[PDB]
Design an enzyme around this catalytic site. Structure first.
Site, PDB file in Angstrom:
ATOM      1  N   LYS B 156      76.059 125.008  60.521  1.00  0.00           N
ATOM      2  CA  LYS B 156      75.201 124.884  61.255  1.00  0.00           C
ATOM      3  C   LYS B 156      75.472 125.454  62.748  1.00  0.00           C
ATOM      4  O   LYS B 156      75.503 124.581  63.744  1.00  0.00           O
ATOM      5  CB  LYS B 156      74.339 123.718  61.277  1.00  0.00           C
ATOM      6  CG  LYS B 156      72.898 123.781  62.070  1.00  0.00           C
ATOM      7  CD  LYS B 156      72.379 122.427  61.818  1.00  0.00           C
ATOM      8  CE  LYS B 156      71.825 122.165  60.279  1.00  0.00           C
ATOM      9  NZ  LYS B 156      70.733 123.337  60.061  1.00  0.00           N
TER      10      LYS B 156
HETATM   11  C1  LIG Z   1      68.768 127.468  58.053  1.00  0.00           C
HETATM   12  C2  LIG Z   1      68.564 125.933  57.738  1.00  0.00           C
HETATM   13  N1  LIG Z   1      68.474 125.537  56.205  1.00  0.00           N
HETATM   14  C3  LIG Z   1      68.432 124.195  56.018  1.00  0.00           C
HETATM   15  C4  LIG Z   1      68.024 123.522  57.289  1.00  0.00           C
HETATM   16  C5  LIG Z   1      67.781 122.095  56.688  1.00  0.00           C
HETATM   17  O1  LIG Z   1      68.902 121.108  57.002  1.00  0.00           O
HETATM   18  P1  LIG Z   1      68.624 119.653  57.027  1.00  0.00           P
HETATM   19  O2  LIG Z   1      68.176 119.248  58.488  1.00  0.00           O
HETATM   20  O3  LIG Z   1      70.079 119.189  57.032  1.00  0.00           O
HETATM   21  O4  LIG Z   1      68.149 119.182  56.106  1.00  0.00           O
HETATM   22  C6  LIG Z   1      67.887 123.704  58.516  1.00  0.00           C
HETATM   23  C7  LIG Z   1      67.824 122.826  59.692  1.00  0.00           C
HETATM   24  N2  LIG Z   1      67.624 123.133  60.800  1.00  0.00           N
HETATM   25  C8  LIG Z   1      67.389 122.194  61.746  1.00  0.00           C
HETATM   26  C9  LIG Z   1      68.695 121.600  62.006  1.00  0.00           C
HETATM   27  C10 LIG Z   1      67.064 122.991  63.175  1.00  0.00           C
HETATM   28  C11 LIG Z   1      65.564 123.482  63.374  1.00  0.00           C
HETATM   29  C12 LIG Z   1      65.474 124.726  62.394  1.00  0.00           C
HETATM   30  C13 LIG Z   1      65.235 123.846  64.753  1.00  0.00           C
HETATM   31  C14 LIG Z   1      66.401 121.056  61.711  1.00  0.00           C
HETATM   32  O5  LIG Z   1      65.365 121.410  60.878  1.00  0.00           O
HETATM   33  O6  LIG Z   1      66.554 120.091  62.271  1.00  0.00           O
HETATM   34  C15 LIG Z   1      68.283 125.245  58.691  1.00  0.00           C
HETATM   35  O7  LIG Z   1      67.877 125.664  59.977  1.00  0.00           O
END
Ligand SMILES: Cc1ncc(COP(=O)(O)O)c(CN[C@@](C)(CC(C)C)C(=O)O)c1O
Ligand SMILES: Cc1ncc(COP(=O)(O)O)c(CN[C@@](C)(CC(C)C)C(=O)O)c1O
Ligand SMILES: Cc1ncc(COP(=O)(O)O)c(CN[C@@](C)(CC(C)C)C(=O)O)c1O
Ligand SMILES: Cc1ncc(COP(=O)(O)O)c(CN[C@@](C)(CC(C)C)C(=O)O)c1O
Ligand SMILES: Cc1ncc(COP(=O)(O)O)c(CN[C@@](C)(CC(C)C)C(=O)O)c1O
Ligand SMILES: Cc1ncc(COP(=O)(O)O)c(CN[C@@](C)(CC(C)C)C(=O)O)c1O
EC number: 2.6.1.42
Lengths: 304, 304, 304, 304, 304, 304
Positions: B156
């Site tokens: 991430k």
């Molecule tokens: C590209 C992407 N794919 C999956 C997830 C979900 O992961 P999780 O939170 O570990 O279940 C995300 C999560 N994105 C975060 C970290 C950032 C937002 C999009 C601002 C979140 O949902 O908290 C991801 O980006």
């Protein structure tokens, strides 16, 4: 390091050029930048292909739909201002447009505006002071460059460099000066942060943009200079083996300028020294700042 | 917006949490982050799967070889401190590890260290107020997600979000709430910033990590909860058409939580409302903060 | 080195086992071979999964349509004969079926027959005498393994090893003990000459044959042994990043046996020593020749 | 069949040119070879593009890092010696560099040296007696040629021919004279052992090396001859359908020379006989050995 | 041939069931259809999995957004009507929804409606009268099936069959009864007009829908039947070589029913006759119409 | 709509041109067609590139092996006949060769013959009345065009248009006039039913046929016209981003003629009006029917 940095229209002291840690670009790679070079020449300090670089800055921002309040001319005037204000005769200029302190949502709220920065400072040869005369040793990386319709490679955006970081660090970790990346198809793309050129039987050769190769300004200049020298240029997809069969191979970039590659993967590139064609091109390129090579295209923009 | 932000070991006031504009991460997307949530529960404020998120932060930094001086326990204590210090009962925590003010070279100089930040603030539902009860309308984007061996999707990292910006903005520009991306092969990957789940004949279905889908913590929780409810889960590659043939489809994420998708590309998903299975899972997930669902895995970490 | 080699039905002295330089296989890679191991055990010299290896020899020849005059039983008897005739108690057996002195045309003339050879000789640990206890350092190669419908990876043919030569030599040239290759898609395939296994949360994990991974006999034995130990095994496509997030990773092969991998690309694999699960499996595998592990499948074929 | 074979510097009698059955190349396809032709001309026996083939032999060995102790000139002298020594006026020469009797490990031990052989013997038309005048019937094979970054197609190595064996045998099994292979993308690559040429509206057309097509010496000669005849040549990726829409189509190779293709998949190629352009090129090629076509490039090397 | 055809709600005489030559579907392949079978059973004429087929008809129309005015129940009643009206006890039913006489623009004008047709007629064994007892000889085609995100393979639309025409005719042109197609990746997809099944060590094996294999109703029934017989079923990607190593291989479809394949590419499939597992499945399938196999799922819909 | 339609050699009244509902082409997309235009010119009604279109009809039928009993000349005479018989001075002609009432097996029985139809009728601007002067707004579709070796894109067959239906309807559903499709690699292919052209620094640019772009007759004419005007034309693979960086972009086709694109995905294409180069080409194209542009190639076929 220098004395001032142009920040949103104002000349701020280098040390006070700060931005909040919750700036969008720090979290999401939402920035677009350029690399421009100022050369001390026969007609004083001159910015190489100034307009072209500022136009690409706008183009990169346009692809991501980043609002840019400054016109190309405003940015060019600001650029010259920074060089003068810092008393630089030769330097590396770094224009940066980024999404600042907006929300934490991936998509910035409607009506937002970007922050712009222009920093200039002296910088040496990107691949070593002895890289221009004697070549460098390159390695074909195990990491591939971005696929065609994922993250646009024509744009010079911040987030793009996680890839360059992976390709370049792998090469240096194993004792090489730079890494060469292949695309997802297994064809030559470019170096971690520079375009790649080969030279077979007196003919150039460079991968097209569709091989995930960024449309370099230096790359473009070399193709136009080559045509003036009467050298045939071929823009085609190149296989990995071609690096081993090439008579000459070199890299191009604003920071890297024109760096010959004396070996790829421990396999020597014909003679192990800078080749004949690469030499002619180097002389023709640097000759622009000596007056020996006539600036027929208007590539030299006087700082004054 | 809140009072303090944990910055390299010190609780600094929000307004003073600034960093230099020449910070590496601003120019090259060289940052790694997390999304954590604190919920007000039957046992007071609790951070959902705290250790798991901190371990993933370290794993993301490990892939890019970013030096992290703080241990997982140190980061966890710092996290609880931020929440207490700001008097938050429920919030969205945002840990960020980035390459700061080092050189302008793509590869940071040996011996460098990263800057770490932990900001917490209250944040509502990522896809909207009504989103959890009534579904959202999704669109299959024309932009694909990163290819397998280019920029690691398991991490991430900041630079990854240029892709999420393209996918998500396209959907919103056309009137949809979120965009669904396919990988380079034409199979379903995930939403712009959340994992995708389908539900056929009482069976779940989710794309494997190899479909360029990030290993979500919420995704993992849902799989484990489903197994407790006696629901069959299948991790397999899914074609685009499957979205039109599915009885139910929903998205998962820390910010998005569990959001049902009532339609894809203007084609209604069975009834056009939150489905039966999605409902059972939502009740089981939110039941963890009410006490109705027993925390058998130790996912609730007390802030105190 | 040994005293005799079985050649077309006759025990010939090692030094007289010659073949013409115009043999088809020397020019076109037209050969099929096996790797079998003879172990000194609690019940004397025993050939591990003898029938299975001879059946694969026939299968590899069948795919290329190479005529084999000898039956599986004939080859097995000849194999035992070679071990006895050379007074070996433990050795590495090498059956080889090749297209001999026929024309120079790529396609052998109708009615041709192949030459068969069975050589046995003592051979140590393929990756080093200390490789079994302390792990090895592996590197992800820049060369990919054969695409799906080009040169069949299920067959163990001579021409296949130009690939293994490229992958393995690149790793050793950079100081690693073995190289791990990805397929054309960017997913994990296997090592240069051994199957790859990971271990996440107590679960195994191995790439399927469709990831260009050869159906190893050792790989098959480990999956069956794992099921006896009550370890969950998952045969699925694995991404490159998984190597960095795995708790344990090891390689399998007839020559390599079961070799733990302590690091991949300079990134340590949990603790940097042989892991818990790999240990259990090693003990269970070697226990077959001590009597500790009951041979429930009939994998031990007595030489007598 | 002939009298002598050049073996590591010595002229050995054909019957005595034997090598050990444990030679590396027999088990791992670790050999590199060439196909050269000696023609009886108006100036006596002459080897067609002798130096070019010897240089390619060195290039193929270079890619695989096989140590070659003989220089290009040494190999050329040895080649002429073989032809004279056997009293041949016209023949097919076959240079072979292979990894001999070293260990059984995939990677040969440091300090090893390769064995070299040069055999010459009279050989007729590769695709048949009538093939040159009347065309041949070709079939598009179900087997694809090697992917870009797997096993280098620019090299003429032994192991490469397992693919050519599959493509060519499939065609002959179904009643055709030769098989045409597509690459992994579905584009035309080349024949089983010869390059492919099309002819549309008076324009040539040939797939680039990146279509997994080997850089044939005959291919190169035809391109240069066509340019002398004022024929436009285009090196571009060709789709499968193009074979059905082409006015003419022919194959090139040292053994196959210039063979017209009268039909592909049972679909006749304009008239079903050798076409106009193919005819002009055939006459221009064979005219080199009659004196009608002046050897402006120095392709004819006298044997004396 | 029969007496009546259901056309837009009316029982029209076969001879009068005509449509204009400017019907959209005739020029653009804009049609969706099904293949259903009526069997004479122990309980009289019965339609095998009637609802399932009508539900798939609606699903295929939904993907292309073709407006369907008839409900699934209306179509089922209409189907039984056609069978009765024609005095058929066993037949092949053919429901067809197509875009009729609208404009010549590719996209039909808003507010248009589709034409529906249901024809029934007796039809014998699709692959030959003897095909069910003695197997058929299949060939792997040189033509690949549609890529993932181009033309949806989950839908049974008219335009899809240009591919089936190419794959199937190539096989028959060379003396085989049916052709097996691979996907764009080089993996097994299915036969020209039927799903493919393998049988290794007593285990089933079928390619997933993601291998461009249509979600066959017969395929689904066989998987459910096998689970009743206690046979392990694995839905995984299969390589081309697996066809040569399989103990048994057979095809399934409404018209083809369950046809064993005794050879692939001239290579005999274990014994060259219908295998043990295939036999058990055939007996279990046909036993449904004899009463021997209990209809636990409600697959038999009475015509009355 | 018109009075007569040529049907298998007979002038049939429009209303009586019916075919059975069990016609093969209605169920399997087994048809091949053309799009020809008749223009009222300075020399009376004239068919633009008549022979070329009829030759392509035969070519498309040849690929699928559909037997065509009419010669190209017979079809041309029939075409002129239809125009005269209906008293048309300008019209859109539609030749259609389809597999009629044969069996229901995918492969038609040996000895079958096809049905041929030629309908002419007046048809306006395909993309809108104002589309030729003011541009159209296009959208890049989420659906990709057919992969290289699946369903031949060089042929203009009925079944191909399920893809065009998906690409085109998606665009119109979102408010755009036409959709632009990418190939499976992520490169620009063409519009839903027309070829795509870009214009960078005074240079043309069009994707090659290998990008799954149909070899358009209008496309060919434009390339030949541009060469007459002294405009450089480049046939190369184009990336998606190029649409945003192009100075001009337009589409070509028989029905669409030459339509400028003023925006792609909401991003304006330089000025948002018809560009300079596009204008010159439009004037040169339409000038052929006014006499201003000399017909050097014999593209105008008199109806008489
Ligand atoms: C590209 C992407 N794919 C999956 C997830 C979900 O992961 P999780 O939170 O570990 O279940 C995300 C999560 N994105 C975060 C970290 C950032 C937002 C999009 C601002 C979140 O949902 O908290 C991801 O980006
Ligand atoms: C990935 C990549 N490819 C090519 C180039 C060269 O483009 P140009 O400068 O326009 O000729 C670059 C440029 N990299 C810059 C911006 C950064 C340095 C490598 C740190 C530069 O050379 O100025 C690139 O990154
Ligand atoms: C490419 C490759 N992959 C796997 C295996 C292991 O298979 P198995 O021996 O049946 O468990 C091998 C095997 N390599 C042999 C034949 C050669 C040595 C590596 C020299 C062997 O281990 O015996 C393989 O090559
Ligand atoms: C796969 C393949 N492709 C092209 C060529 C032709 O190359 P060239 O001789 O350099 O023009 C070949 C050549 N094959 C030779 C070397 C071997 C025969 C097939 C036995 C030959 O024709 O002499 C090739 O194999
Ligand atoms: C391409 C394709 N794949 C599978 C199947 C089998 O589906 P099902 O009938 O649901 O089990 C088919 C079906 N083909 C039909 C519709 C047409 C004949 C081949 C003429 C049929 O078997 O009824 C398919 O086409
Ligand atoms: C998919 C596709 N691509 C290009 C063209 C243009 O071909 P041409 O007419 O030869 O220049 C077409 C043509 N489409 C026709 C046949 C149908 C209309 C779009 C309804 C036409 O323009 O006449 C194509 O379909």
């Amino acid at each position: 390091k220098a004395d001032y940095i142009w920040f949103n229209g104002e000349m701020v002291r280098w040390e006070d050029a700060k931005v909040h840690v919750m700036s969008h670009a720090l979290h999401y790679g939402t920035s677009v930048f350029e690399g421009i070079r100022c050369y001390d020449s026969h007609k004083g300090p001159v910015v190489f292909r100034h307009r072209e670089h500022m136009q690409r800055l706008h183009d990169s921002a346009k692809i991501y739909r980043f609002p840019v309040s400054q016109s190309i001319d405003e940015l060019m005037e600001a650029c010259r201002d920074v060089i003068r204000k810092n008393n630089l005769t030769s330097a590396y200029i770094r224009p940066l447009i980024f999404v600042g302190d907006v929300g934490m949502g991936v998509n910035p709220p409607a009506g937002y505006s970007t922050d712009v920065i222009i920093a200039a400072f002296p910088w040496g040869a990107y691949l070593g002071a002895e890289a221009l005369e004697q070549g460098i040793d390159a390695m074909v990386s195990s990491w591939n460059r971005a696929a065609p319709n994922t993250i646009p490679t024509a744009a010079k955006a911040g987030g793009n460099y996680l890839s360059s970081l992976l390709v370049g660090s792998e090469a240096r970790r194993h004792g090489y000066q730079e890494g060469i990346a292949l695309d997802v198809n297994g064809y030559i793309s470019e170096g971690a942060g520079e375009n790649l050129f080969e030279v077979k039987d007196g003919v150039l050769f460079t991968p097209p943009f569709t091989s995930s190769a960024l449309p370099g300004i230096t790359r473009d200049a070399i193709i136009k200079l080559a045509k003036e020298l009467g050298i045939e240029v071929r823009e085609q997809v190149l296989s990995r083996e071609s690096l081993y069969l090439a008579d000459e191979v070199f890299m191009s970039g604003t920071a890297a300028e024109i760096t010959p590659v004396r070996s790829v993967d421990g396999i020597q590139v014909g003679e192990g020294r800078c080749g004949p064609v690469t030499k002619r091109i180097q002389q023709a390129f640097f000759g622009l700042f000596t007056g020996e090579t006539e600036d027929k295209w208007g590539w030299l923009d006087q700082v004054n």
